[PDB]
Design a protein around this nucleic acid. Structure first.
Lengths: 450, 338, 339
DNA sequence: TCACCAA
């Protein structure tokens, strides 16, 4: 009875109409005989489980969070990008309490779902309430990101892990001991049913082989060495950190310098990575109220040594160093004191790239190849064993509104990550330089050459 | 004074990882390496001989309990013909304690900001900058490595600086107390960097620290090691050149700079600065919230700490240690919601 | 007295690997080396001649049994023109038994400190520190290399120590018993290091041991060897001058300093110090949990020893040998949880 | 406050 259990549970693909629904009664157990027993408290409580059936799980890192999402990936997006729209959206699950994770197997096992029989149906149809966002931002545990929309005024974004992308990636990466990197979580019945089946292990997408760097108005920041960053760039892939983290680094480097010179305005930024070193370190979370630690998780981290070449609209030494930003995706970023000689600006790209020392790194260029799927990704990850996938932008789920609690007094919408493939150039100057692009339904850090 | 439902600061002190190197006696510097090697110990666990009721178990006889117990550990040691080990990190003090990172209430946002300009006026950053800097200059950030060694030297390299790289030679002998750090040639040129940092709207004060550990022959080193969910002691590592090298964390380091708290009702040892200040030798919470001297029962008294510092009288030690502990948690940062 | 769900100590003795050098007649030192080499033994195993029941396997004829059994071992030996062999490591004694490294019960943490404090007041560190120090000052850490050898000589270099390196020349002849160590020039001064190491809240006492083995012509040296899951003997190794050399495990060297336990019932031979003290020769535990004299049956009577050690009447030999075993485990380390 | 729950 274990293979019948896995076949209805959302991390196995799907599947003579009387054996099924008399098994579906018997998956609330923790047969035809107890299939006859009709508790009025069993029929009314089984309706509560579809009421917390959820599209995108807000409880995915932090099981303390609080909110219900039954919505669809909003919009459409080009071929080289990849979100929870391009994969057919039907693997959904239960995101509520651990009391009802087996009693949710009668009406949420889903090709579609099962969402005095007539009396039950009348209440269910009225409250079925599909396409639902019920999140309040103040007394819970959500991420929050300010990103600029148009010329001025930022938008707050709370990324939420989609369930149809997780169970997609967990199934295709079974046979691959090389492109898969497992993260394990604890107290997994508080997570949801889509985490019970895998047992807590989630089988992410690792960036293939190792990193090896071959020899390779423009302000040059050399040897930005981040010690402990995050490799969880998406809830789906691990590797080099996301490209909204390298953008938010520069637009904190801009926005500090706009205290003195109010028209600085970096246009684009060239990234030259040496020495990734992705690794599972630890994260001792802080004691939180009965006073003990919160739930134990697993965290990947990376130790980047990159160098950065900007593109300015048009400055002392000591103005730059005190106005560097000090965190690149949770990790402390620093320039050594002896490397402060190399912060000088230039005028031509061919001298600015010959200017910086420690030459042996790869510039980041997006692999703009039509893709739609993980097999579309993995096929390009073997012709280039150095191709690394990560998060490139945020795919929204509703339009940004006024909320009573928002990140820094802006308009807030809920987003989801977008996964693209990232090249490496030996050195098309425009293609190398990245910038923030706003799409009425997403926001993606693209190169200039797209 | 009631707390907002959004309150957070960034951290004011920002460390990095600690790399380990090996200095050969021909002054050739090679990064430190390690290996995993399997061992075989006894079968002591107190669960393998005793059951849950505490009664002796009947499966594990005299023979079954003397059998063999193979396990694997990462093993890092100092190479043979080496001389010493150069452990180097870098700090920063950017004064992020000035305004909050996130706050919804503007009445409350005045109260925490007007405490600080009442603090550097009335008490000033002499006391805390004395305390943080006496964790860089001695061997707190080296952790277990300082223990069981011959001698260790510390060398600073500050950034807004002119000449004479600051040296600290032979700790455990010279630099034992507070006054012995003051009697250095340039100690008050460096406390006036942290004081300049916290009191400026943008004051920065980079350091660049480098230790030198003279170990015994062929000795162990103890880096920080990972927290996951086979190998039972997996060290943290970073790629220096082409070698794997054991490091000490960016959070293992910053917990050593911030062991300050001896302001609790019964303080015999300094504790890491945090809400309801915890100890991990004995798993207890000094400054438990029922005692009423935790951090959330000081923000609620932050209004009373404006009429205290506005009085011309010097306030007592009972009610400026709350002011020192209030500052050390705003330096530490973190969400303050309730 | 119950045991907490978190209790642990660190250890108070910290050894290192033992490195082996070849000292030529010109006084120049080269690291030792080894090699794997295949061989051809008989086919003596008794699983190859007799079945589980006892009667012979009929497919193992006379011709079949004598067929040659090829295998492979690592083989280390002294070179031809060599003279002797240096072995060298370093120990610590470092007061980690004063209090638990971790303990989440407040009553138990206060009790185990009062055992360590009433032990040095009433009994003192003279018996333990002598028993550990003899195993440094002979070749107990040169396990089998000492056997089948002409002579070995030990030379200390203690660190909180002014001058006059400590020497032990020609053991097997000179330093046989306890009194032969006490008759040394500077012996009581070194015992006063380990007594001051354990008695202080920062006692440190670093030693630097160096030995000298005069083996016969072209003789055999036996290092420690690895655990593996086709070579049948793989040595543990390091790198000294870019050439791999055999080493004596750091864990192995600490298992030789601490062969102290001979306080068990009907005890003849000193065992390694551990909970329910095992014997690896004949695979059995002395001090079984039914004997009443393992560790966790002496821990759960730790209140009873406080009424004994605090009285003016001197404690009996049964109840100080239970305290010698109790401290020697707190120097060993380990985790003492239950439930 | 406690009875709920998996691979």
């Amino acid at each position: 009875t274990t293979e019948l259990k896995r076949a209805f549970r959302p991390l196995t693909p799907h599947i003579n109409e009387l054996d099924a629904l008399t098994i579906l009664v018997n998956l609330t157990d923790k047969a035809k005989c107890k299939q006859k027993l009709r508790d009025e408290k069993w029929w009314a409580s089984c309706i509560n489980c579809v009421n917390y059936r959820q599209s995108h799980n807000p409880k995915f890192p932090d099981i303390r969070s609080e909110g219900v999402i039954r919505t669809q990936a909003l919009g459409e997006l080009p071929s080289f990008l990849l979100s929870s729209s391009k994969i057919p959206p039907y693997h959904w699950s239960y995101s509520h309490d651990s009391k009802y994770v087996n009693k949710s197997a009668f009406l949420t096992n889903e090709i579609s779902c099962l969402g005095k029989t007539c009396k039950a149906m009348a209440k269910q149809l009225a409250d079925i309430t599909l396409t639902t966002i019920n999140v309040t931002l103040a007394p819970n545990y959500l991420t929050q990101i300010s990103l600029p929309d148009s010329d001025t005024s930022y938008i707050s974004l709370s990324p939420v892990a989609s369930l149809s992308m997780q169970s997609h990636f967990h199934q295709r990466l079974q046979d691959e001991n090389r492109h898969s990197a497992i993260t394990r979580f604890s107290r997994t019945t508080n997570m949801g049913v889509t985490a019970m089946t895998c047992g807590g292990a989630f089988r992410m997408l690792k960036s293939g082989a190792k990193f090896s760097s071959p020899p390779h108005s423009f302000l040059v920041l050399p040897n930005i060495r981040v010690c402990g960053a995050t490799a969880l760039s998406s809830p789906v892939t691990v590797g080099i950190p996301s490209l909204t983290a390298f953008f938010g680094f520069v637009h904190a480097f801009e926005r500090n310098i706009n205290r003195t010179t109010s028209s600085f305005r970096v246009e684009s930024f060239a990234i030259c990575v040496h020495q990734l070193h992705v690794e599972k370190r630890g994260l001792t979370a802080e004691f939180v109220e009965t006073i003990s630690a919160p739930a134990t998780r697993d965290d990947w981290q990376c130790d980047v040594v990159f160098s950065l070449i900007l593109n300015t609209n048009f400055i002392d030494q000591d103005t730059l160093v005190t106005s560097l930003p000090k965190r690149l995706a949770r990790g402390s970023a620093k320039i050594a004191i002896d490397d402060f000689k190399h912060i000088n600006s230039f005028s031509t790209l061919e001298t600015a790239i010959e200017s910086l020392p420690i030459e042996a790194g790869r510039w980041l260029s997006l692999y703009a190849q039509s893709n739609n799927n993980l097999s579309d990704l993995l096929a390009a990850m073997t012709e280039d064993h150095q191709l690394m996938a990560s998060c490139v932008g945020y795919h929204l789920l509703e339009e940004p509104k006024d909320k009573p609690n928002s990140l820094r007094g802006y308009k807030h919408a809920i987003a989801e990550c977008i996964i693209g493939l990232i090249n490496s150039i030996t050195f098309d100057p425009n293609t190398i330089f990245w910038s923030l692009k706003n799409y009425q339904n997403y926001l993606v850090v693209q190169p200039r050459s797209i | 004074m009631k707390l907002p439902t959004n309150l957070a600061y960034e951290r004011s002190i920002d460390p990095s990882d600690v790399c380990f190197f090996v200095v050969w006696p021909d002054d050739r510097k090679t990064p430190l390496t390690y290996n995993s090697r399997t061992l075989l110990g006894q079968m002591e666990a107190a669960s393998l001989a005793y059951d849950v009721s505490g009664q002796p178990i009947k499966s594990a006889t005299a023979e079954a309990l003397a059998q063999g117990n193979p396990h694997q550990v990462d093993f890092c040691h100092v190479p043979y013909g080496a001389s010493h080990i150069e452990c180097s990190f870098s700090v920063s003090f950017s004064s992020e304690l000035r305004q909050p990172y996130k706050c919804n209430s503007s009445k409350v946002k005045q109260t925490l900001v007007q405490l600080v300009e009442l603090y550097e006026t009335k008490i000033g950053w002499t006391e805390l900058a004395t305390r943080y800097l006496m964790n860089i200059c001695n061997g707190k950030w080296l952790w277990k490595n300082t223990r069981k060694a011959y001698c260790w030297n510390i060398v600073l390299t500050p950034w807004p600086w002119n000449g004479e790289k600051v040296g600290f030679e032979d700790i455990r002998t010279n630099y034992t107390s507070r006054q012995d750090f003051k009697n250095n040639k340039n100690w008050s040129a460096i406390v006036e960097m942290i004081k300049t940092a916290f009191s400026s709207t943008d004051g920065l004060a980079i350091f660049e620290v480098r230790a030198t550990l003279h170990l015994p022959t062929n000795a162990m080193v103890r880096p920080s090691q990972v927290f996951t969910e086979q190998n039972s002691r997996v060290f943290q590592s970073t790629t220096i050149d082409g070698e794997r090298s054991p490091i000490l964390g960016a959070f293992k380091t910053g917990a050593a700079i911030a062991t300050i708290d001896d302001w609790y009702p019964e303080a015999t040892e300094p504790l890491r600065v945090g809400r309801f200040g915890v100890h991990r030798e004995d798993v207890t919470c000094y400054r438990h919230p029922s005692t009423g001297k935790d951090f959330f029962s000081i923000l609620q008294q932050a209004e009373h700490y404006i009429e205290v510092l506005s009085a011309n009288k010097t306030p007592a030690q009972e009610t400026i240690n709350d002011m020192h502990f209030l500052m050390a948690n705003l330096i530490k940062g973190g969400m303050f919601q309730h």
